[PDB]
Scaffold this active site. Structure first.
Site, PDB file in Angstrom:
ATOM      1  N   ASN A 184     -21.535  -5.127  -1.593  1.00 56.65           N
ATOM      2  CA  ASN A 184     -20.528  -4.762  -2.616  1.00 56.65           C
ATOM      3  C   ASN A 184     -19.116  -4.960  -2.059  1.00 56.65           C
ATOM      4  OD1 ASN A 184     -22.070  -2.247  -1.526  1.00 56.65           O
ATOM      5  ND2 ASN A 184     -19.928  -1.589  -1.719  1.00 56.65           N
ATOM      6  N   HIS A 188     -26.467   2.339  -5.116  1.00 57.04           N
ATOM      7  CA  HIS A 188     -25.154   1.826  -4.680  1.00 57.04           C
ATOM      8  C   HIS A 188     -24.654   2.585  -3.457  1.00 57.04           C
ATOM      9  CE1 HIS A 188     -21.086   0.293  -4.825  1.00 57.04           C
ATOM     10  NE2 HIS A 188     -21.465  -0.584  -5.759  1.00 57.04           N
ATOM     11  N   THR A 232     -18.523   4.811  -1.987  1.00 55.91           N
ATOM     12  CA  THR A 232     -17.225   4.099  -2.043  1.00 55.91           C
ATOM     13  C   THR A 232     -16.087   5.114  -2.002  1.00 55.91           C
ATOM     14  OG1 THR A 232     -17.072   4.031  -4.437  1.00 55.91           O
ATOM     15  CG2 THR A 232     -18.249   2.198  -3.386  1.00 55.91           C
ATOM     16  N   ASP A 237       0.872  -1.197   0.000  1.00 52.53           N
ATOM     17  CA  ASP A 237       0.000   0.000   0.000  1.00 52.53           C
ATOM     18  C   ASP A 237       0.901   1.237   0.000  1.00 52.53           C
ATOM     19  OD1 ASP A 237      -2.189   1.998   1.021  1.00 52.53           O
ATOM     20  OD2 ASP A 237      -3.302   0.107   0.585  1.00 52.53           O
ATOM     21  N   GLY A 291     -20.740   0.398 -16.286  1.00 56.03           N
ATOM     22  CA  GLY A 291     -20.626  -0.541 -17.414  1.00 56.03           C
ATOM     23  C   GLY A 291     -21.123  -1.920 -17.040  1.00 56.03           C
ATOM     24  N   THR A 337      -9.325  -6.770  -9.384  1.00 56.29           N
ATOM     25  CA  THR A 337     -10.585  -6.748  -8.596  1.00 56.29           C
ATOM     26  C   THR A 337     -11.524  -5.683  -9.169  1.00 56.29           C
ATOM     27  OG1 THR A 337      -9.870  -5.170  -6.910  1.00 56.29           O
ATOM     28  CG2 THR A 337      -9.246  -7.481  -6.591  1.00 56.29           C
ATOM     29  N   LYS A 361       4.700   2.586  -4.386  1.00 58.14           N
ATOM     30  CA  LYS A 361       3.624   3.100  -5.276  1.00 58.14           C
ATOM     31  C   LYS A 361       3.835   2.617  -6.720  1.00 58.14           C
ATOM     32  CE  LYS A 361       4.826   7.536  -4.401  1.00 58.14           C
ATOM     33  NZ  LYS A 361       6.284   7.713  -4.200  1.00 58.14           N
ATOM     34  N   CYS A 367     -18.681  -5.467  -8.564  1.00 58.67           N
ATOM     35  CA  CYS A 367     -19.725  -5.905  -7.604  1.00 58.67           C
ATOM     36  C   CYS A 367     -21.082  -5.968  -8.328  1.00 58.67           C
ATOM     37  CB  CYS A 367     -19.777  -4.960  -6.408  1.00 58.67           C
ATOM     38  SG  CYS A 367     -19.771  -3.212  -6.881  1.00 58.67           S
TER      39      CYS A 367
HETATM   40  N1  LIG Z   1     -15.600  -1.085  -2.692  1.00 55.40           N
HETATM   41  C1  LIG Z   1     -16.371  -1.838  -3.455  1.00 55.40           C
HETATM   42  O1  LIG Z   1     -17.574  -1.863  -3.335  1.00 55.40           O
HETATM   43  C2  LIG Z   1     -15.765  -2.487  -4.657  1.00 55.40           C
HETATM   44  C3  LIG Z   1     -16.416  -3.621  -5.137  1.00 55.40           C
HETATM   45  C4  LIG Z   1     -15.872  -4.343  -6.183  1.00 55.40           C
HETATM   46  C5  LIG Z   1     -14.702  -3.917  -6.753  1.00 55.40           C
HETATM   47  N2  LIG Z   1     -14.094  -2.805  -6.291  1.00 55.40           N
HETATM   48  C6  LIG Z   1     -12.825  -2.337  -6.972  1.00 55.40           C
HETATM   49  O2  LIG Z   1     -11.741  -2.728  -6.176  1.00 55.40           O
HETATM   50  C7  LIG Z   1     -10.662  -1.778  -6.312  1.00 55.40           C
HETATM   51  C8  LIG Z   1     -10.301  -1.221  -4.959  1.00 55.40           C
HETATM   52  O3  LIG Z   1     -11.496  -0.611  -4.430  1.00 55.40           O
HETATM   53  P1  LIG Z   1     -11.585  -0.175  -2.900  1.00 55.40           P
HETATM   54  O4  LIG Z   1     -13.012   0.152  -2.681  1.00 55.40           O
HETATM   55  O5  LIG Z   1     -10.935  -1.227  -2.082  1.00 55.40           O
HETATM   56  O6  LIG Z   1     -10.738   1.180  -2.848  1.00 55.40           O
HETATM   57  P2  LIG Z   1      -9.819   1.761  -1.677  1.00 55.40           P
HETATM   58  O7  LIG Z   1      -9.508   3.169  -2.003  1.00 55.40           O
HETATM   59  O8  LIG Z   1     -10.436   1.369  -0.371  1.00 55.40           O
HETATM   60  O9  LIG Z   1      -8.503   0.859  -1.760  1.00 55.40           O
HETATM   61  C9  LIG Z   1      -7.406   1.205  -2.626  1.00 55.40           C
HETATM   62  C10 LIG Z   1      -6.151   1.042  -1.805  1.00 55.40           C
HETATM   63  O10 LIG Z   1      -5.009   1.113  -2.693  1.00 55.40           O
HETATM   64  C11 LIG Z   1      -4.028   1.937  -2.096  1.00 55.40           C
HETATM   65  N3  LIG Z   1      -3.182   2.468  -3.154  1.00 55.40           N
HETATM   66  C12 LIG Z   1      -3.405   3.561  -3.951  1.00 55.40           C
HETATM   67  N4  LIG Z   1      -2.483   3.752  -4.865  1.00 55.40           N
HETATM   68  C13 LIG Z   1      -1.596   2.702  -4.661  1.00 55.40           C
HETATM   69  C14 LIG Z   1      -0.392   2.339  -5.296  1.00 55.40           C
HETATM   70  N5  LIG Z   1       0.152   3.024  -6.307  1.00 55.40           N
HETATM   71  N6  LIG Z   1       0.251   1.243  -4.839  1.00 55.40           N
HETATM   72  C15 LIG Z   1      -0.278   0.560  -3.817  1.00 55.40           C
HETATM   73  N7  LIG Z   1      -1.397   0.816  -3.133  1.00 55.40           N
HETATM   74  C16 LIG Z   1      -2.013   1.906  -3.610  1.00 55.40           C
HETATM   75  C17 LIG Z   1      -4.797   2.962  -1.273  1.00 55.40           C
HETATM   76  O11 LIG Z   1      -3.978   3.572  -0.291  1.00 55.40           O
HETATM   77  C18 LIG Z   1      -5.940   2.092  -0.709  1.00 55.40           C
HETATM   78  O12 LIG Z   1      -5.638   1.499   0.554  1.00 55.40           O
HETATM   79  C19 LIG Z   1     -11.144  -0.759  -7.342  1.00 55.40           C
HETATM   80  O13 LIG Z   1     -10.740  -1.178  -8.645  1.00 55.40           O
HETATM   81  C20 LIG Z   1     -12.670  -0.839  -7.203  1.00 55.40           C
HETATM   82  O14 LIG Z   1     -13.378  -0.413  -8.371  1.00 55.40           O
HETATM   83  C21 LIG Z   1     -14.578  -2.107  -5.247  1.00 55.40           C
END
Ligand SMILES: NC(=O)c1ccc[n+]([C@@H]2O[C@H](COP(=O)([O-])OP(=O)(O)OC[C@H]3O[C@@H](n4cnc5c(N)ncnc54)[C@H](O)[C@@H]3O)[C@@H](O)[C@H]2O)c1
Ligand SMILES: NC(=O)c1ccc[n+]([C@@H]2O[C@H](COP(=O)([O-])OP(=O)(O)OC[C@H]3O[C@@H](n4cnc5c(N)ncnc54)[C@H](O)[C@@H]3O)[C@@H](O)[C@H]2O)c1
Ligand SMILES: NC(=O)c1ccc[n+]([C@@H]2O[C@H](COP(=O)([O-])OP(=O)(O)OC[C@H]3O[C@@H](n4cnc5c(N)ncnc54)[C@H](O)[C@@H]3O)[C@@H](O)[C@H]2O)c1
Ligand SMILES: NC(=O)c1ccc[n+]([C@@H]2O[C@H](COP(=O)([O-])OP(=O)(O)OC[C@H]3O[C@@H](n4cnc5c(N)ncnc54)[C@H](O)[C@@H]3O)[C@@H](O)[C@H]2O)c1
Lengths: 332, 332, 333, 332
Positions: D313, D176, D179, D33, D209, D118, D77, D149
């Site tokens: 989700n 929804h 998020t 992270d 989408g 994901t 990163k 989701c």
């Molecule tokens: N939250 C939901 O409902 C949901 C459901 C299905 C899919 N998703 C997808 O899952 C993915 C993550 O969603 P999320 O809700 O967990 O978001 P989030 O913002 O909670 O998690 C993203 C994480 O990645 C970290 N991060 C950012 N840039 C980074 C980098 N360069 N290197 C490493 N870590 C880095 C952030 O600090 C954070 O902890 C997205 O593609 C989202 O569309 C989310």
């Protein structure tokens, strides 16, 4: 011991949940509310705050059926018509939020031996906080109060400070979760105009007797404490912010050690001590009366401190109701 | 007076709104942020908290157009590349939240600006002003200045009234504060503030604040006499100060009310307001006062120990003070 | 026209606000609720959603005093005891939410009122009107009338534009609706709607609505062609209609936008508004239109099957329509 | 199977939670992270939505330590600098939300054998929904997607309708939960202006989408479905509202029976069928992809229906990620 729950609301339902969670020998004979048992069973099984419970529970033959427990449902708004004599009721849990000693005594007139009010009471009603003054209970006390959620959070902390350092004066604020007395959109609350303003749009000042109530459970603190509340947009969990002038010079670390020590000895199962970076949601389902937040507190000098203690105003309080019922069972 | 807004956020946009809501010599010549002017124009015109504004405003050709007034839009994250010399900038409003160290802020001067006003407490001994408290201590030689925090602007006027009338021995402050842009919609990492990353609208969130200590910068007599803490709660705007204060002389709650009411009518005109109404936070959305004393909400323990309540629109009250300080400091 | 407001709630108070905002010659002679006039005055002056109003308004001698308006406060739960004969009442605004059956509402007429306007859908033989859709069907012989729901006032104008331009084969509507006073802050019992008692700001809550069927009452050509449902969500005000519609003739999304834009400029002036902006619900707080078409939000699957999006301030839009209908009845009775 | 979690956010953390909950033989060797392991451990243990987890978990020796599981913490990163070769990584769980196939392939260049995104992916990325098309997975697929989701909720329902009745056309709305892409107060979101408006003050339209993506996992539905979203102020749980014209005449009851049958057989552990009076909070922690709400749906006629299906989700999707990882483990 045969109890009934009068008012199957947030506190009434979570008292039943906490009875089932410890497999209590307490016999719940009836539940009274304003709606039928099908809807009350639904609300007991599905909880927005505390999650689902008793998946095998069913509404059948006008009863809540859960394992060997079959609880009669009543829907009688008038306490004078409740069949407590016929049901041989030892204790009414009075959790409607509607019921002065004179109003509560109608349960005794209807045939109950004792009433436990899940709120502060007016008149000659002994008020108890588990771990503070519950051993003052006398069988001659036929109507008793378990105080407020706020008093159950403040009183244990005040007792630890009184016993270790002495208290000169204290002023308390509780930042409190929204409750059933509030409204979704602006509406009338006749005794509390601010309390009717939209609950999730507002920080809402409120009066609380919690700090004065600590003076009744700890007579040494009579006239030494007062306070106020702010209602805020969370569905559960509240926090006490106690600004206290102590009688002896100490350090913030010595206060932390005194509370940690109390949580390990005299306040076991009542107070908890944390140094974690906690927020309100971390206490959803917490059964303690008072969780001391060591990192959140601040010291101005060796006698003047601001101390922070969390409480699940629903589950913490409901757990104390079951503790007080079991104590009364053993001492009546 | 030619100004630019560096960081067109809650404070940057509402500073522009409050400039347009008065008769002012202030000319806004440029706005800098991280995105294009079409999106910045949209955020200026449509506000979830404060409603729509400037319906005839349009983005054209990299400018915000309002009648014949044209504001340049920039999107340059690096202060060393900002064209302040070419734009003949008298004051930079520094509202990015990133630049509060004198060394970072001085880059605006290097880029050609004559003065910088930081819309936050500064790190290091940057002259800090609260309108109605110490703004007359401004010296034209002060090329980098701070308008302190929203919380300091609420507490300092109240503290000045108490200091002048009764004296202050010691005070501990809590602010119950609206959620802000530093917080997160769902649980995520905030490296300098772990609690501050927990979901903003799911939680009461303790936070550290230097606001009570900062009163010691504007009121030197109160250095070492005040500290405090915050709870962030799920409202989008408006905050409240809860000041627990030990005064130097015996008084009554009514005498405190009279002193604040008198100050609001005289020395604190347009800075402090006095109310006895049944107010809640939403009643202060758009309120331009620094500090609104809630007479009904406060409590007295005794003739020296009081808990006082004062409201503030942390967005609009503070933005209005930025414009007041710009108009005070600048030569015309 | 002498009116009284029975139920001084969100709709009752905002009806009075909208009367005062346009300096209406409508005379508000009394307000009835369950609580004292000082608390009702406070709620009229201070509004969490719509901001402060009428700063010089005061409670004096059992009345709301505002300039030359002196409005009697009553606190009588029983319609049979209301003094409508003594007050010479032309119209009762029935906004308690308790009285929607013709038999219950007729007690206002028995108590001396000439007419009742129910601020909700009505059961029984109650003519229902939507301003800009069928309000000209009002007949002076109609002594009990309904202004329908907020949702019907949003959907019906849009349905009329689609009917008149393209024809409608079938439609299914969802409203994503603000929380209202029927809901609870924490989980509690709602006997006629179990879901509706679950904590309002903790939940997306499915709900039934008759709004789509009600469009068939105001536009008989659409009888049997529409139905729908609602989700209650954690916002204190402003709602949105999501209409999935099969049209009778092939068109484009852009032609629908042009038809709504044209209607908003002509036949639906002051009822429908057309936007292409990146709007969200808070942008409509205080919006007086019945139906704001969101051009950017809608989608087309093909030349006959569309999802159309229209916003409404369920409080202020509806309250403004109540005042518009009262003024129309005043001019046509 | 050795995996790493890239992006320890809502999905990254809850994937790890769901791995531990089933005592999966998947070996989690590292977490990456933007912040240190002490803060990431805190966020793993304390969850505003899903409650506390792994009380015995500690940050120790640069690792998340939970019994015999020791997970290395990274804070890099830049995907091109990630030590996947040195860590012998079989699968990267790509859950940052930042990473086109060409961007995701940098994980392979850094030494990982496979990537599971994901989220929906652009380019030649096989997309799978458990219970719909996951058996189309081939070990030759080095970059794969678990879709959104919303797609995981809609696709199972669409498959049941396709197999029983046929679909002519459908338009979907998802209501929804808010998020992490959203903002606490109004701010700029350059590709989604509405999505920058305060998340808990607004109903916010969004493009999705998800309906078109069902055409990728169910090719017979290409060109037959589209839709939109409304983002609303809940912290978790979402609902699909599918307006569908079927190819054959049926009844609402026949649709209910077909979904009930599927939930008992072909869609076991993917779809659930309820007739309870459910609301969103009832699905917090629900592991199903799609929960059909029998009471909520409506029929206009024998071919035109509005169907309602719930999804957590966060936890539903996280559980599907673990299911897909275990399927890949068993078939590679
Ligand atoms: N939250 C939901 O409902 C949901 C459901 C299905 C899919 N998703 C997808 O899952 C993915 C993550 O969603 P999320 O809700 O967990 O978001 P989030 O913002 O909670 O998690 C993203 C994480 O990645 C970290 N991060 C950012 N840039 C980074 C980098 N360069 N290197 C490493 N870590 C880095 C952030 O600090 C954070 O902890 C997205 O593609 C989202 O569309 C989310
Ligand atoms: N919620 C908390 O945080 C909290 C904490 C401590 C104490 N309390 C106290 O407990 C009591 C109950 O509070 P609550 O939060 O559960 O409220 P609530 O509104 O959830 O529950 C009250 C219940 O009583 C029922 N009821 C009302 N009138 C009735 C009557 N005439 N006969 C029978 N049932 C009737 C209601 O239908 C409802 O189900 C109050 O006195 C409150 O102050 C509440
Ligand atoms: N919100 C309040 O209640 C409040 C009150 C008083 C003071 N403040 C202070 O004012 C400052 C701004 O707070 P805010 O609430 O407006 O925050 P915000 O996040 O709304 O605004 C910051 C703005 O700066 C922009 N930005 C970020 N980095 C930039 C850069 N390098 N160059 C140019 N623009 C950049 C962001 O895109 C954003 O629009 C902070 O220092 C805050 O502490 C805020
Ligand atoms: N709120 C909306 O969005 C909206 C929109 C359109 C229509 N409506 C309809 O308008 C009506 C009022 O809704 P609201 O949202 O204003 O509700 P509300 O609860 O805010 O107002 C109802 C008012 O009636 C009072 N009341 C209750 N019983 C009474 C009685 N017997 N006598 C007198 N006063 C009594 C209550 O004290 C309250 O002040 C309902 O029929 C509702 O469906 C509401």
């Amino acid at each position: 011991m045969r109890i009934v729950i009068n008012g199957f609301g947030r506190i009434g339902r979570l008292v039943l949940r906490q009875i089932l969670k410890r497999n209590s020998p307490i016999e719940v004979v009836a539940i009274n509310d304003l709606v039928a048992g099908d809807l009350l069973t639904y609300l007991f099984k599905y909880d927005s705050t505390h999650g689902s419970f008793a998946p095998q529970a069913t509404f059948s033959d006008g009863c809540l059926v859960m394992g060997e427990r079959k609880v009669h449902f009543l829907a009688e708004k008038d306490v004078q018509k409740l069949p407590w004599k016929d049901l041989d009721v030892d204790v009414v849990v009075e959790s409607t939020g509607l019921f002065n000693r004179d109003d509560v005594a109608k349960h005794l007139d209807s045939g109950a031996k004792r009433v436990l009010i899940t709120a502060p009471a007016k008149g000659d009603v002994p008020t108890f906080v588990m771990g503070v003054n519950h051993q003052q209970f006398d069988p001659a006390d036929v109507i008793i109060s378990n105080a407020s959620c706020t008093t159950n959070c403040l009183a244990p902390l005040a007792k630890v400070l009184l016993d270790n350092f002495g208290i000169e004066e204290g002023l308390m604020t509780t930042v409190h979760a929204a409750t059933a007395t509030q409204s979704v959109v602006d509406g009338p609350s006749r005794k509390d105009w601010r309390g009717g303003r939209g609950a999730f749009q507002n920080i809402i000042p409120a009066s609380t007797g919690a700090a004065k109530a600590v003076g009744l459970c700890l007579p040494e603190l009579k006239g030494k404490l007062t306070g106020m509340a702010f209602r805020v947009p969370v569905a559960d969990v509240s926090v006490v912010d106690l600004t206290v002038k102590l009688s002896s010079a100490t350090t913030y670390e010595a206060i932390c050690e005194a509370v940690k020590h109390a949580a390990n000895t005299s306040m076991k199962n009542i107070m908890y001590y944390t140094e974690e970076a906690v927020v309100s949601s971390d206490f959803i389902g917490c059964e303690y009366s008072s969780v001391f937040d060591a990192q959140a507190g601040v010291a101005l000098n060796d006698r003047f401190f601001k101390l922070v203690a969390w409480y699940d105003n629903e589950i913490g309080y409901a757990t104390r109701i079951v503790d007080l019922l079991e104590y009364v069972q053993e001492n009546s």
